[PDB]
């Protein structure tokens, strides 16, 4: 009925695209993207909207006057005339006005810290019905004005910019019970063993499987429960309200295809009655909607949940290395009452970033495939890549020494969890393929986009190192490519970067210490003839000499 502090909402408008008011909401990605864009929620039948990166949380709603004093240095209800703070509900980035163009309107972005006036945005109705001081209700057509630039959050023609013309930003709510299922939550699917999807570089990862053991840890056992509705997506999960399932790592919707089987298909093929399921308590096939958080119905831990497709009434059963293949059938077994379990927020935060790493580098691979074969211009992102490349280093930044111990341990425990997730989806291998195709020429492409080629390669290894520095696993996963790194060691371009990967591996892989041979180490000592005098080489040779604690005397 109202809008208060700490309530998840969206910012929706319309646009005149071919006689239809395209009901589009504000979208901005994060962790790869600082800029804002549009997501149409009109075609919810065929190409349903990515509602994860559209929602925003009203972190603080204070007036203009009660802010500048605080800036010189509690579910409060929103009133018109208050400057609100719109943190992005996924990336934790605050919505701000920028200092750039896309045209004398500034641009709208998601910056990191709440300091500065750009993060705050005042609300004013464009309605003579309601005025200032009135409680902001559900679904009021309102205008968002900045505080720094004091420009309107405007829908330009098809881009978001802080302009001087106004736009009615209709605010549909999403949510506001702990331990009960809430829609929108990325979560697993337990058995008593969990539902999985095939691993990296494996089919285009489309099959559906039950699997026990250590796949519950993995990201490929994560499933986002997306409702059909735009508003009140964070309603509590009831028995029988509809849900478009969508796999996290591939970014594909779980769809019933009558031609083959239950499959993972993309955004565009997944029509509603081909992909949306519901939940049943028994295996029977006996409400439409409520507007609110709804009935706090089903638990995470203690809930035996049968899964039924809407359009056909099929049930999620299994066929039968345990790669127990899950399918859809009219009856199935009595082992279809699948228990649920939520993911942690960081677990969800990694894996959405994983699909962000996916769509970014694969365009970067295919763009590199275009200008490697023939010269002269398939879209090759550079800045978008380097923005993510810098950010992921920051994502995998180690905890500070100037941090308190227990929090440092938690962040490090978080860090390894962040690291383990990229290995088990093959992001390490994905980076490994990008280092392949870039290390071809020597500064081909457009050399303002291809100008940062030197700085891209450096930070690739600096990413690649950082995904190693803690884990005994992932360094042992460089069993294979360790000889290849010593092969590209003598590129002399980013040769410190190859070494810094190879340093931190050989601190933590007694596995790979025993791999390395004469001519490899000869080449490492040969590199010291190349690059003058680097003590960097020496600590590598120190680490090739001494293990974790023991000696390798043949070395």
């Amino acid at each position: 009925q109202f809008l208060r502090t700490d309530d998840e909402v969206v910012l929706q408008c319309t646009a005149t695209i071919h006689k239809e008011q395209q009901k589009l909401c504000l979208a901005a990605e994060g962790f790869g993207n600082r800029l804002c864009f549009l997501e149409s929620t009109s075609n919810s039948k065929n190409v349903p909207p990515d509602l994860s990166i559209c929602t925003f949380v009203l972190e603080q709603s204070l007036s203009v006057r009660a802010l500048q004093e605080m800036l010189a240095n509690g579910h409060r209800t929103l009133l018109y005339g208050h400057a609100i703070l719109l943190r992005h509900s996924y990336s934790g980035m605050y919505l701000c006005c920028l200092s750039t163009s896309r045209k004398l309107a500034f641009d709208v972005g998601l910056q990191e810290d709440t300091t500065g006036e750009a993060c705050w945005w005042t609300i004013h109705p464009a309605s003579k019905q309601r005025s200032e001081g009135e409680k902001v209700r559900v679904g009021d057509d309102l205008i968002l004005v900045s505080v720094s630039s004091e420009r309107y959050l405007h829908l330009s023609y098809l881009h978001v910019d802080a302009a001087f013309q106004q736009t009615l930003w209709s605010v549909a709510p999403i949510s506001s019970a702990q331990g009960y299922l809430i829609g929108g939550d990325v979560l697993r699917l337990l058995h008593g063993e969990c539902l999985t999807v095939p691993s990296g570089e494996h089919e285009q990862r489309r099959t559906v499987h039950y699997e026990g053991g250590a796949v519950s840890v993995h990201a490929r056992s994560l499933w986002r429960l997306e409702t059909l509705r735009v508003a009140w997506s964070g309603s509590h999960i009831r028995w029988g309200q509809p849900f478009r399932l969508r796999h996290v790592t591939t970014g594909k919707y779980l769809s019933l295809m009558e031609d083959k089987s239950l499959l993972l298909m993309d955004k565009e093929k997944a029509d509603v009655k081909s992909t949306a399921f519901t939940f049943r308590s028994s295996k029977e096939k006996l409400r439409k909607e409520v507007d609110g958080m709804g009935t706090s119905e089903i638990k995470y831990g203690d809930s035996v949940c049968f899964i039924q497709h809407i359009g056909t009434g099929l049930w999620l059963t299994y066929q039968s290395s345990i790669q127990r293949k899950a399918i859809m059938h009219h009856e199935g077994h009595m082992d279809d009452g699948l228990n649920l379990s939520r993911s942690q927020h960081e677990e969800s935060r990694t894996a959405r970033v994983i699909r962000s790493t996916v769509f970014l580098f694969n365009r970067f691979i295919r763009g590199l495939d275009a200008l490697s074969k023939k010269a002269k211009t398939v879209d090759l992102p550079i800045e978008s890549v380097s923005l993510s490349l810098q950010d992921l280093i920051g994502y995998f930044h180690p905890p500070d020494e100037h941090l308190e111990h227990e929090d440092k341990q938690n962040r490090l425990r978080a860090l390894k969890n962040r690291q383990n997730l990229f290995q088990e989806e093959g992001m390490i291998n994905l980076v490994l393929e990008c280092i392949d195709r870039l290390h071809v020429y020597s500064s081909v492409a457009g050399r303002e986009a291809g100008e940062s080629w030197k700085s891209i390669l450096n930070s690739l290894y600096e990413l690649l190192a950082a995904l190693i520095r803690g884990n005994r696993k992932n360094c042992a996963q460089f069993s294979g490519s360790l000889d290849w790194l010593i092969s590209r060691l003598e590129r002399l371009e980013a040769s410190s970067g190859i070494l810094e990967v190879l340093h931190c591996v050989l601190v933590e892989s007694p596995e790979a210490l025993n791999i390395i041979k004469e001519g490899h180490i000869k080449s490492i000592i040969s590199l010291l003839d190349k690059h003058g005098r680097n003590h960097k080489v020496l600590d590598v040779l120190c680490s090739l000499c001494v293990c974790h604690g023991v000696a390798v005397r043949s070395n």
Binding site: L104, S148, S149, E150, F164, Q165
Partner: protein
């Protein structure tokens, strides 16, 4: 507010005169009255009509030299929304409808008469085009540039200052004796605005001397002479002495009283050039020896010889219509 709604063309002249002088009154006005003005500007899509509104708004926010801020803020904020690229299409109109040319001059003056007060700079820095119109009005002429300079002065180092300088074309076209005759006396008060490497500055000091040669109108020349006394006080010293070398040729032409006062202005400048000198310093001792013939040539002379007393102390620092 009665009169505003009437004024569609005079009637808005009346509202103008009702405001101009008084600070007190100009503060007292409210914002929707000003909004009715600019909504009439929004109607101008084609003008001549809009120039009377912006003239009104010019006398809305400035009023005593001190740009009154509460007017200045709210005036501007509405103007972004409907102002209503625009530089270069104006540049067509010179060679062509005189009202379109005068229009944007008055628009830029409104913005020129106005300067948390930092964001208003930024929108006014959002309108680059600066030197473009400065290049136009070297060629009706005088009104456009003086509005651009006051825009340039409030909104928007010494390198870019010398970058702007056919102000020599103003000083040289003084001998055309009628639009240009009225131009030059307008650019005498415009010459006070540049009061606030060395080679191109010597051309401009000679251009200031060419304006002083056009001076050697009358009260405007007193604004030019005050612009001349501040110019030599602002400045190397040999380039100031190269300007004093062409002034020594004018000092020979001086000894009518305006050229002697220009020489009295160079006399305390010679007191400044004496400490830098302690070339033509021998000819500077000959200028004080020509001032001994000026002592042979002689209440206003008490002020002229007290400047020559500084020139007597300056000669001893060196002795220590074509």
């Amino acid at each position: 507010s009665y009169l505003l709604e009437n004024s569609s063309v005079t009637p808005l002249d009346v509202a103008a005169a009702s405001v101009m002088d008084n600070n007190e009154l100009a503060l007292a006005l409210r914002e929707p009255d000003l909004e009715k003005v600019v909504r009439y500007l929004a109607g101008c899509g084609l003008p001549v009509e809009g120039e009377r509104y912006l003239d009104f708004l010019r006398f809305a926010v400035f009023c005593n030299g001190e740009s009154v801020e509460e007017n200045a803020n709210v005036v501007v904020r509405l103007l972004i929304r409907r102002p209503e690229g625009l530089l270069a299409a104006m540049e067509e109109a010179i060679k062509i409808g005189n009202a379109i040319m005068t229009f944007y001059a008055a628009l830029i003056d409104l913005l020129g008469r106005c300067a948390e007060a930092i964001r208003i700079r930024s929108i006014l820095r959002s309108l680059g085009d600066l030197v473009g119109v400065i290049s136009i009005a070297f060629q009706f002429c005088p009104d456009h540039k003086a509005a651009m300079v006051l825009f340039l002065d409030r909104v928007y180092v010494q390198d870019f200052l010398l970058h702007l300088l056919g102000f020599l074309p103003d000083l040289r076209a003084a001998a055309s004796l009628t639009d240009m005759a009225l131009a030059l006396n307008r650019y005498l008060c415009t010459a006070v605005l540049p009061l606030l490497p060395l080679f191109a500055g010597t051309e401009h000091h000679a251009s200031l001397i060419d304006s002083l040669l056009h001076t050697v109108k009358g009260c405007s020349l007193t604004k030019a002479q005050r612009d001349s006394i501040e110019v030599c006080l602002l400045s190397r010293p040999s380039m100031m002495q190269h300007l004093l070398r062409r002034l020594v040729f004018d000092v020979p032409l001086l000894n009518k009283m305006p050229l002697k006062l220009l020489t009295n202005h160079y006399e305390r400048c010679w007191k400044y050039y004496c400490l830098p000198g302690g070339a033509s310093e021998e000819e500077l001792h000959l200028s004080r020896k020509l001032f001994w013939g000026i002592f042979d040539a002689l209440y206003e002379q008490e002020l002229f010889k007290l400047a020559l007393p500084c020139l007597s102390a300056v000669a001893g620092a060196l002795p220590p219509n074509f």
